[PDB]
Design a protein around this ligand. Structure first.
Ligand code: AVJ
Ligand code: BR
Ligand code: CL
Ligand code: MG
Ligand code: MG
Ligand code: MG
Length: 430
């Protein structure tokens, strides 16, 4: 009696008995930030039912919704169990599954407060979720309102871009100041700048080591035909800057999940003011305070020879096999021998394998399980890298968020490696 609009309820007891079943898919339709652990309705335990997959109901407007579902391996032969903060928030998702040929769809009504409120009901969360902030958190922050996971009295919202002030001037978070990516990294090496330059640059942008820095960027459809495609990949640049600031010693760095798009999707006010900087005289800590976050070429070579270490290549497949360099300023094509490949996505300016279509980070369990299939696991010292370290920093950040204890960015990347003609490299399909 398949009813597209009337959905079977599943009880708490029934769901608890199915937690280990391989043919049940439990689907969390709340925002990815709530899934990660943010207690968006004041629940005492945040996160998701253990084993649940993330499928935010916001994505129902995506024309590729069904391909998102299929790529998550959610199949018509599965028993689908949907939950959100309320069963009403699941109704449109339940219908969309039934309209696309899924005949076994139930809704679980008692996730909150029944499941969240009882410590015998298993839940999971992204261990360092408080570094990956939702738009509502940033809005409360700049509004001077009490927000969770924030006990500081000093903050700065920083809009990152690579030589493209228009990315900021065309629309930004109220009160934010822009930080060009060249302020923290050198155009000669495309590595992080020296400690003296970083100190000066951070001070001139109004940042101290005890300032809470909220970083975001704007995705503006990077095109390889342009001279600087990176000028349109603002949110990768933001995570790259988060890497450098955390290396330098900013103790509390946050990243807005999904970048500028999350802010406008949440309906918040846009500003076009060119906000002047409020400089500070003293950064307030030795730079770098966290040198272990950065790996340079000599240590990278050692890691290729150690059993407990790996370099992780976060480049595209055409870069991997030496078909393209990836960049209009890199001539050499190939790959570092001995690195573990973790395909970023389609090219140097897209991170589709680490992101959702709305640019929020991919469900971390999926990233975790793919990495584990290649032997990328938390018990190793891992140095993520890419062409010059932007994509590598975004991979690194994702592992940092899972609480992995020895993750780093090999800053130099393929740019530095291939610039020494004495360094071995491989090419072609392996
Ligand atoms: C280091 N720059 C800013 C020159 C890179 C940054 C980058 C973006 N996606 C991969 N790398 C570039 O824009 O090519
Ligand atoms: Br981006
Ligand atoms: Cl039915
Ligand atoms: Mg299951
Ligand atoms: Mg670099
Ligand atoms: Mg090794």
């Amino acid at each position: 009696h398949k009813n597209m609009y009337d959905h079977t309820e599943i009880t708490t007891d029934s769901l608890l008995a199915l937690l280990g079943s391989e043919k049940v898919k439990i689907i969390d339709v709340r925002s990815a930030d709530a899934y990660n652990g943010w207690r968006m309705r004041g629940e005492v335990r945040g996160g998701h039912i253990k084993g649940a997959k993330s499928l935010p109901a916001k994505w129902l407007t995506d024309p590729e919704w069904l391909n998102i579902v299929r790529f998550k391996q959610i199949r018509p032969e599965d028993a689908i169990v949907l939950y959100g903060y309320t069963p009403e928030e699941c109704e449109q998702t339940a219908t969309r599954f039934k309209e696309n040929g899924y005949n076994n769809v139930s809704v679980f009504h008692r996730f909150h407060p029944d499941w969240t409120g009882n410590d015998a009901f298993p839940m999971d969360r992204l261990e360092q979720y408080n570094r990956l902030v939702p738009a509502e958190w940033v809005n409360g922050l700049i509004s001077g309102e009490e927000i969770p996971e924030y006990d500081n009295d000093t903050f700065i919202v920083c809009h990152a871009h690579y030589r493209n002030r228009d990315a900021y001037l065309s629309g930004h978070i109220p009160g934010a100041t822009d930080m060009d990516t060249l302020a923290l990294e050198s155009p000669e090496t495309w590595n992080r700048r020296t400690p003296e330059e970083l100190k000066k640059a951070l001070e001139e942008h109004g940042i101290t080591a005890s300032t809470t820095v909220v970083l975001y960027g704007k995705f503006m459809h990077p095109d390889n035909a342009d001279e600087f495609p990176g000028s349109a990949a603002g949110h990768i640049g933001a995570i790259r800057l988060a890497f450098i600031m955390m290396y330098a010693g900013v103790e509390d760095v946050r990243v807005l999940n999904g970048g500028y798009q999350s802010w406008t999707d949440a309906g918040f006010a846009i500003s076009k003011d060119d906000v002047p900087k409020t400089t500070v005289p003293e950064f307030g800590a030795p730079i770098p305070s966290r040198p272990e976050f950065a790996v340079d070429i000599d240590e990278a070579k050692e890691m290729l020879q150690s059993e407990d270490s790996d370099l992780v290549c976060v480049r595209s497949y055409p870069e991997y096999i030496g078909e393209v360099s990836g960049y209009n300023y890199i001539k050499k094509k190939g790959r570092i021998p001995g690195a573990i490949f973790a395909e970023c996505g389609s090219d140097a300016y897209h991170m589709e394998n680490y992101r959702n279509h709305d640019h929020t980070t991919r469900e971390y369990h999926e990233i975790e399980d793919i990495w584990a299939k290649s032997g990328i696991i938390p018990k190793k010292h891992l140095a993520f890298y890419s062409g010059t370290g932007w994509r590598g920093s975004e991979a690194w950040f994702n592992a940092l968020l899972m609480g992995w204890p020895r993750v780093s960015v090999y800053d130099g990347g393929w740019f530095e490696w291939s610039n020494d003609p004495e360094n071995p490299y491989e090419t072609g399909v392996p």
